UniProtKB/Swiss-Prot annotation, chains A, B, C, D:
Record organism: Aquarana catesbeiana
Domain Ferritin-like diiron: 6-155
Lineage: Eukaryota, Metazoa, Chordata, Craniata, Vertebrata
Sequence similarity: Belongs to the ferritin family.
EC number(s) stated in the UniProt entry for this protein: 1.16.3.1
Keyword flag Chaperone: no
Protein name, per record: Ferritin, middle subunit
UniProt entry keywords in alphabetical sequence: Iron, Iron storage, Metal-binding, Oxidoreductase
Length: 175, 175, 175, 175
């Protein structure tokens, strides 16, 4: 075992690798949503940029898990990054609904990792997870839910004017 | 009696305590409206912030009545702060209608206190009331009425797009 | 249930509402202490301002619980804010003793909420509570205890000179 | 009658002259308190300066009544300025007690003038009185009462240490 390793269970090490992969998969999904909203026949560029930002933040989280793994003396083991579920994402409402579900999936994986860390009496891992994530993850879920509520109010999916307006007012003006 | 007391009738002292309580009750109502518009299934954050601001201003008025009471040599006597009338506030139009009524209630209480002060020949109290309030209170009533007119124009309660637009254009961009 | 809700037990949601109420009640108690020390026949204005500051901080904590409730998909349910225990607070020593007890009461309520969150395996709620509170709450208890020790050293309740001096040196110079 | 005169009753004009005189008399009393606390066998220089400031503010009020009289088309009629009641003022507590009474006397004269103005249906005079005075006068009475409370707490008249401390901490550090 690594000379640095202390109080780091093999099961936790493995779960950290799986979380790293899930973050990479979430990044890649959000990148697909960006590409979709950038299409000439979609053309909602602030929505696109929102998803791009999220893609970059999830890749940053993956990198933090890599660094954490090494700091504890575990070993990074990479797997394929699965392509997203869909090739096209319908409209702003459907994409936001898919994002909500993705964020909930990631949150559940973090909850599960925290439970594992707790059961293995690893307070360092618990602190790490409670110091990069739960706050940020609940805030992202909240924001997406707020957006879904507003998209429904705006008459999505049918009301194209409403969709247009969402892109101008709800998401930050981009690039 | 207090060594500072001069020309301060017991009835006025009591009415000042009741006004303090009413201001605290109004604050608390506006705080409830904030919380409602912050809900994920409401999600009108500029509207929420408008109500939050109003909540803070009414608490500041309560504090001014406390200070006034002591300056005159009366004694602050606190009562329970009753919870708001409603737990949920419907939509922007219903909330604004409720605010209009609340503001009118507060204004009537101020009018009544001014009449009492007049009848007790207390020009200091009259001046105090005419120097923190009537101007500001009539302006708040006017603004809420203007908003109600605009919400009706925008098709509330049915027109969700209209509601959405009100939050972007009528109330100051927030937090 | 709310579209955002995940891993948030009904009992926790309810306990968050009760904590919100307790914070509002603590705020209101401290506001009463301010008003008392501002009286012309008390007249310890730095002491008064200390309590005013504490009143504002407890209201800010209540607002944080409101926001938290919504972020998790729970529903804010407000109750009456009970008036303080006393209408008059004796002197600096008695007020500080009452504050000590109030702070301990609030701390116990936070401890109890943390135990509940732990039992419901809600690390997000535990982190929230451990990230706004325990540090600050133990520091406030310590400061009030330090003050009580100093008030006793200064000869309270009998030694008015000592009381006078406390207001000039122990609490920050105010307004 | 003066070409400017409108709605200005002779009785009000006369009462304005008497108020001018009372303000000059109050100024002169406070000047005597200054001189007393400046004595080598009294030697409380911050207390002295407090009274000096008050003397200057009351002379400024007298000048405002002069200007007001002319603005309304009345005629300034001066009388002797009576010397103060006492030649020596005992100690800080006795002087503050005398100031409290003086301030109350002035306030009562203002109240009486406001009642007269009201009875003569002179809103300009009422506004003038409510715009230079009641606020400031109640605040001065409050401050003096606060000081009396503190002087008693400090053990006046017997406790010279307490008196000494009051001059260092209660009144602004002077000249
Ligand atoms: Cl190990
Ligand atoms: Cl192991
Ligand atoms: Cl790390
Ligand atoms: Cl597809
Ligand atoms: Cl998913
Ligand atoms: Cl955004
Ligand atoms: Cl009275
Ligand atoms: Cl009375
Ligand atoms: Cl005031
Ligand atoms: Cl309701
Ligand atoms: Cl009402
Ligand atoms: Cl606004
Ligand atoms: Cl849940
Ligand atoms: Cl549940
Ligand atoms: Cl929060
Ligand atoms: Cl009591
Ligand atoms: Cl308690
Ligand atoms: Cl302090
Ligand atoms: Cl005339
Ligand atoms: Cl006349
Ligand atoms: Cl003038
Ligand atoms: Cl004499
Ligand atoms: Cl007098
Ligand atoms: Cl001073
Ligand atoms: Mg080795
Ligand atoms: Mg292994
Ligand atoms: Mg495949
Ligand atoms: Mg545990
Ligand atoms: Mg823990
Ligand atoms: Mg985030
Ligand atoms: Mg996220
Ligand atoms: Mg629809
Ligand atoms: Mg007394
Ligand atoms: Mg009474
Ligand atoms: Mg009830
Ligand atoms: Mg006025
Ligand atoms: Mg206002
Ligand atoms: Mg108002
Ligand atoms: Mg309509
Ligand atoms: Mg729903
Ligand atoms: Mg429940
Ligand atoms: Mg009760
Ligand atoms: Mg604190
Ligand atoms: Mg505290
Ligand atoms: Mg003792
Ligand atoms: Mg002429
Ligand atoms: Mg005449
Ligand atoms: Mg004589
Ligand atoms: Mg003054
Ligand atoms: Mg004065
Ligand atoms: Mg004594
Ligand atoms: Na007036």
């Amino acid at each position: 075992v690594s000379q640095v390793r202390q109080n780091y269970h093999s099961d936790c090490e493995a779960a950290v690798n799986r979380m790293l992969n899930l973050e990479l998969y979430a990044s890649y999904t959000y990148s697909s949503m960006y590409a979709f909203f950038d299409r000439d026949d979609v053309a909602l560029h602030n929505v696109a940029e929102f998803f791009k930002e999220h893609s970059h933040e999830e890749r940053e989280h993956a990198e933090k898990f890599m660094k954490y793994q090494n700091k504890r003396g575990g070993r990074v083991v990479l797997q394929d990054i699965k392509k997203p579920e869909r090739d096209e994402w319908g409209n702003t409402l459907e994409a936001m609904q898919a994002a909500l579900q993705l964020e909930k999936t990631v949150n559940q994986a973090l909850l599960d990792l925290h439970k594992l860390a707790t059961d293995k009496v690893d307070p360092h891992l618990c602190d790490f997870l409670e110091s990069e994530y739960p706050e940020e993850q609940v805030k992202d879920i909240k924001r997406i839910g707020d957006f879904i509520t507003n998209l429904k109010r705006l008459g999505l999916p049918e009301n194209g004017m409403g969709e247009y307006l969402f892109d101008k007012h709800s998401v930050k003006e981009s690039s």
